[PDB]
């Protein structure tokens, strides 16, 4: 985050709305429901992750079909797009639907 934004804790991974600055965060070891909460699901975000955390996102529900992109640190919104996925495709994770936070 920029100046004044509460930082992600070291073991925490967040997605931050590009429009509002509001966030959805999980500790390392947790994942979302089948989809992210309705207020953020499929909305434009960037990752803001603490030093020990890695955010796994999917553009689909339920972290599925190896459509998984990995994000660390404080990610520029444009770097959510065209990202290498586990399944060998390059996907758009700017509007994610599901999320897991793991140790980096």
């Amino acid at each position: 985050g920029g100046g004044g934004a509460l930082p992600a804790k070291e073991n925490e991974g967040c997605i931050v709305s590009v429009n509002s600055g509001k966030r959805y965060c999980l500790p390392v070891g947790q994942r979302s429901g089948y989809s992210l909460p309705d207020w953020i699901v499929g909305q434009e975000v960037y990752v803001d992750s603490g030093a020990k955390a890695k955010v796994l996102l999917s553009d689909w529900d339920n972290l599925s079909y190896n459509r998984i992109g990995e994000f660390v640190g404080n990610v520029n919104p444009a770097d959510m797009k065209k990202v290498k996925a586990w399944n060998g495709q390059y996907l758009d994770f700017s509007k994610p639907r599901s999320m897991r936070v793991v140790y980096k």
Partner: peptide, 8 residues
């Protein structure tokens, strides 16, 4: 192997 989604 991979997580899946609900069917139609």
């Amino acid at each position: 192997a991979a997580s899946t989604t609900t069917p139609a």
